[PDB]
Amino acid sequence: MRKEAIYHRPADNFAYAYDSETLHLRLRTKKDDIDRVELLHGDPYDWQNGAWQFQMMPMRKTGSDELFDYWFAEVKPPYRRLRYGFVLYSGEEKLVYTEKGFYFEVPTDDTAYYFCFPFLHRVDLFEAPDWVKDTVWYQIFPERFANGNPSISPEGSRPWGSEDPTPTSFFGGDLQGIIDHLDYLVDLGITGIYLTPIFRSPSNHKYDTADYFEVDPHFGDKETLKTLIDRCHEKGIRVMLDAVFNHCGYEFAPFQDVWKNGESSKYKDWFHIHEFPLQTEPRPNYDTFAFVPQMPKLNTANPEVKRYLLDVATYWIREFDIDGWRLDVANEIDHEFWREFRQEVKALKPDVYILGQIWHDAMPWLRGDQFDAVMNYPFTDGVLRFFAKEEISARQFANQMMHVLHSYPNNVNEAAFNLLGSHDTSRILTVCGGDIRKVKLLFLFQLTFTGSPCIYYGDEIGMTGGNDPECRKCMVWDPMQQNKELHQHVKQLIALRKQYRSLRRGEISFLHADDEMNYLIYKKTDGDETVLVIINRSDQKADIPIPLDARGTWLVNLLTGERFAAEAETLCTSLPPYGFVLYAIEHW
Amino acid sequence: MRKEAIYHRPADNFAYAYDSETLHLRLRTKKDDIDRVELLHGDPYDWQNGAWQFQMMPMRKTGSDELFDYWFAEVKPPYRRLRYGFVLYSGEEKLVYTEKGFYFEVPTDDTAYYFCFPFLHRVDLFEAPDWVKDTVWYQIFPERFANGNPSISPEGSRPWGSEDPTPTSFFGGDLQGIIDHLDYLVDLGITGIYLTPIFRSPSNHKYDTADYFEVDPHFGDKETLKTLIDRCHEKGIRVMLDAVFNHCGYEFAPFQDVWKNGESSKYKDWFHIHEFPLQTEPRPNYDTFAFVPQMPKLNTANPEVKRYLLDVATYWIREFDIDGWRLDVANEIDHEFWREFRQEVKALKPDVYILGQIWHDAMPWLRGDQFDAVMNYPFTDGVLRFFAKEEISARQFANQMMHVLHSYPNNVNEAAFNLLGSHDTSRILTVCGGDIRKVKLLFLFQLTFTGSPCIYYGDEIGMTGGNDPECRKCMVWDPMQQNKELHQHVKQLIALRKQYRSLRRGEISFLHADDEMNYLIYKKTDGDETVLVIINRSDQKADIPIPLDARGTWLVNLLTGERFAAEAETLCTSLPPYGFVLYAIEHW
Ligand SMILES: OC[C@H]1O[C@H](O[C@H]2[C@H](O)[C@@H](O)[C@@H](OC[C@H]3O[C@H](O)[C@H](O)[C@@H](O)[C@@H]3O)O[C@@H]2CO)[C@H](O)[C@@H](O)[C@@H]1O
Ligand SMILES: OC[C@H]1O[C@H](O[C@H]2[C@H](O)[C@@H](O)[C@@H](OC[C@H]3O[C@H](O)[C@H](O)[C@@H](O)[C@@H]3O)O[C@@H]2CO)[C@H](O)[C@@H](O)[C@@H]1O
């Protein structure tokens, strides 16, 4: 029992309101250092004789990362007010952790010793559109999906798929192409399309916005967008658009004016300009995305720039009915803006998925007053290092997955954007060194993990390539090229996910196999149903023992449909190289 | 090194923008475990020759508590963007602490391992009024200060000072009384007056409001309030009113109504009612302050309530130019509401001090989007447990002191409302058990601590009594009965506080004393100023040595005036029981 490692603080991941009456509490201890923990809790004003009235509830260890045990307790305070503490036991030896420090005995003559959650407010409750939890995304890079209309393909467009993607090449893909391949997506199981920037911009990626109210001429038109979205909506698909608000393009109307007028520009305060007139040599004299001259940072602090951006935001929702906004480099925009952004957006269309792009611990942006989710990169890094690269062991993977999960609140975790790759990364199959068997595992872990999974175009058919622009080759539409074992694999898994809530929203726990270096075993539970997953992460066959109690326990193979039961001597599966299996557990 | 004890989370007290180009980073470690710490930092996009240009800035240990060491670092990102990690040294052993975990050597092929502080936006910077940081408040209980206008006292009042008050007694205290005695305060040094509730309320404490827009008649009228405030302004004193928004009183018009027309009431949504019709037996079927039927909880999520309390907030400010609101039981009101509260208030009178009564860690209400400051109860707890009750040791008081301070951002601690007692706690003299010496040590530690200190009426003249109602006696105006020793003592200190910047805005640290059981040596510094204080929390004469490097060292007794130099053998200090001394330190 080492106090040095004990920790809890009343906010974010450690203390939060799950729903209106239930609030969850976490505690963190040294790995294996504690046996059991009990939450001390009671209404702040419940008193009898100079004694505070409390109840004791045991906490359950929900996971462990490299060097910490995480404990969980969910209490529905009688009057929505609560004061709590923790009683730690190490082989019957006890300790008392509170806001005022530790003690051998439980203080009861005042409540200032204890941590406090003053009151459960419905309006503060974190809440992300429920649908996203059941959705399964497919990110599209319009320029390279499908050229469904050549008349508007920019001059120079290379023959589709012909050569390798360069920073300045074009192939003529357009929104019409997407409308032209929607069934394909509807067949895969996709239920949401996330598109990358489409508003008019010089480049092929469109991350350097030219006009936030115009559909890039080469992609199509308002008329064309609407039909895309409506066609998607009738097919049961939601549409997410990308919003590059951190900065604009060199060609942004206002920026041009500041450049050709400088100090006297009607828009000098629209940017982060230090010296006049603007320069670029050696480096820019005005803040930019990184050090890119064509991407001058917008000043979201100016009431105008702010009004404008808020207009753009509501415009598209109000005029096209998109179901969400993906906002890149969002972590670089001030919280004050994001606070409004939500207010306005949510005022218009309540269940709009506001996904901010953040490449690090995003807790400050996931409290309920801003984004609904972020890009779960820790998930990405993890899954790849284990399944694809094979650089970390299974205990390590379980460690990092638990580490990222206990880092946020449960409801925030339920709406996490889980992707294995993107337009800014290498192609998952290329990371797998070309091993399809591995990619199969990624999708497997992806599609059984709680949250909102996203699939990068072509990763389901086996596309390959390095990192940007290499990961942006044209979609592959010829069957003789698109690895079908994967298609059916993905398609198959997407089906299971829709079928099993535990997969979509349940809790995850890792069972210790007799080799935490190549075999990974875990299960998903939403309290009602339970699915079990066993993976053989190695290039050899293996006989794996399923660690389950057999009393009234039945397992169902979700891939073959087969069924059977665990006896007074349960069994052990055995998969081939990179093999796997899913079992629905029944407790009769 | 103890990895499990090392900790850092990019937010709240650990990472925060101090100003518009300077941000603070803080790290936690097991006390004495780490030799040195260095902050590894650099701009997220400054790469050259394929290597991330990052620098190594050494960190400073600003204190420790029971179990930890706290390290500090001040950094100005060249482009207001920053990626960082921490490097720890213990002998030859090296650890690199990052968002992605511990490493035994600086990873450099990426910036993702590192903790991140995206951008420095002025709109996200924390800012409490500055005037507050040089103020010294005096808390008054209008009912017990002075019966300036005996024509409006309530029927039944007792001759001023007749006997010990009761929860229902009245001594006809009024606002005129305050005005009449302003000179007494102007003489003491008071530069800020905080008043408890003054709006219409059947009680003698007025915490159960009847009408937020009416000044209790027995206290005075709108007109009388102006003059008190206008007169206060010319004597250079700020005025702060106490607003009770968490709950109303049984006599509050809207509630009375619900109490007549149940579920049909046009106001049933201004409260937290569980079943209709309302009931108080066996217990109230509606949420109240604690379990007090007379105090119905307002539902600040309701749009009408919300708009109402906001108008009340800006009404008095707007028409009476008050200098700040002390918001009662603020931790039980939703965050969203406080966010409007600040928006509204600040747009009206930016320098309005927004103080919230939160009896526990309040990090969540102090991010700059809600409260400017809260009652620093931890302060009071430590201060009394050591100087008054003599329960904890000096070392303990020290840790407790650092523990709190390090749980908040330097700029937040800069505006803390540091009080020793209220109309809710007993009397400081009564807690010292009569010893005027101990109490005298309290004013000392209070008036040498950073923040905004406050003095309970009478404390400065030796008034006594137990916990509510006993602590709310009638202000002793008889010179034959008030304790003039303390008065001057207090008048003496507030003066030094005024002239010694380092005393109100400086950093604090505890010079390890020999008898780490009864002596306390600490100094205050703001970068230039440097005051040192030595206290003999003992009932015996003590010879206490001064731990200071004496190469160009000049001490200045801020009490006698005497000046002297420090020699190789650090000068020792002789002090009587419970004696004390403050020196000004000059390095030449
Ligand atoms: O300017 C050159 C590149 O611009 C565009 O890159 C986009 C990127 O595609 C988009 O996802 C986003 O990325 C945000 C992150 O960028 C880096 O990875 C930082 O480390 C991280 O802190 C950011 O959050 O924004 C950029 C800029 O618009 C083009 O897509 C890319 O092809 C160009 O090479
Ligand atoms: O009739 C009930 C009481 O009402 C008033 O009490 C005030 C109190 O003076 C004011 O500071 C504030 O206190 C809130 C705190 O109350 C307790 O101390 C809890 O331990 C703490 O957690 C709360 O934050 O609000 C109450 C209610 O108005 C009268 O002053 C008091 O005499 C009455 O008993």
UniProtKB/Swiss-Prot annotation, chains A, B:
Q: Name one Pfam family in it.
A: Alpha-amylase
What is its biological role?
Hydrolyzes pullulan efficiently but only a small amount of starch. Endohydrolysis of 1,4-alpha-glucosidic linkages in pullulan to form panose. Also cleaves (1-6)-alpha-glucosidic linkages to form maltotriose.
The name of this protein is Neopullulanase
User: What is this protein's gene name?
Assistant: nplT
Query: Which residues hold substrate?
Result: 247, 326, 423-424, 468, 472
Cofactor dependence: Ca(2+)
Any one GO MF annotation of this record = identical protein binding
Q: Identify the InterPro entries for this entry.
A: Glyco_hydro_13_cat_dom (IPR006047), Glyco_hydro_13_lg-like_dom (IPR004185), Glyco_hydro_b (IPR013780), Glycoside_hydrolase_SF (IPR017853), Ig-like_fold (IPR013783), Malt_amylase-like_C (IPR032091), O16G_dom_2 (IPR045857)
What catalytic activity is recorded?
Hydrolysis of pullulan to panose (6-alpha-D-glucosylmaltose)
The similarity annotation says: Belongs to the glycosyl hydrolase 13 family.
Give the positions the UniProt entry annotates as the active site. Answer: 328, 357
Sorted alphabetically, which keywords does the UniProt record give? Calcium, Glycosidase, Hydrolase, Metal-binding
Q: Name one GO biological process term.
A: carbohydrate metabolic process
What does the note accompanying the cofactor annotation read? Binds 1 Ca(2+) ion per subunit.
Please list the residues that bind Ca(2+): 147, 149, 153, 172, 174
Instruction: Quote the CDD domains the UniProt record gives.
Output: AmyAc_CMD, E_set_CDase_PDE_N
How does this polypeptide assemble, per the annotation? Homodimer.
List the EC numbers from the record: 3.2.1.135
Q: What class of enzyme is it?
A: hydrolase
Task: Name its species.
Answer: Geobacillus stearothermophilus
Q: Does the keyword Iron-sulfur apply?
A: no
* SMART domains xref list: Aamy (SM00642)
Site feature: Transition state stabilizer: 424
Question: Which PANTHER family does the UniProt record give?
Answer: ALPHA-AMYLASE FAMILY MEMBER, MALTODEXTRIN GLUCOSIDASE
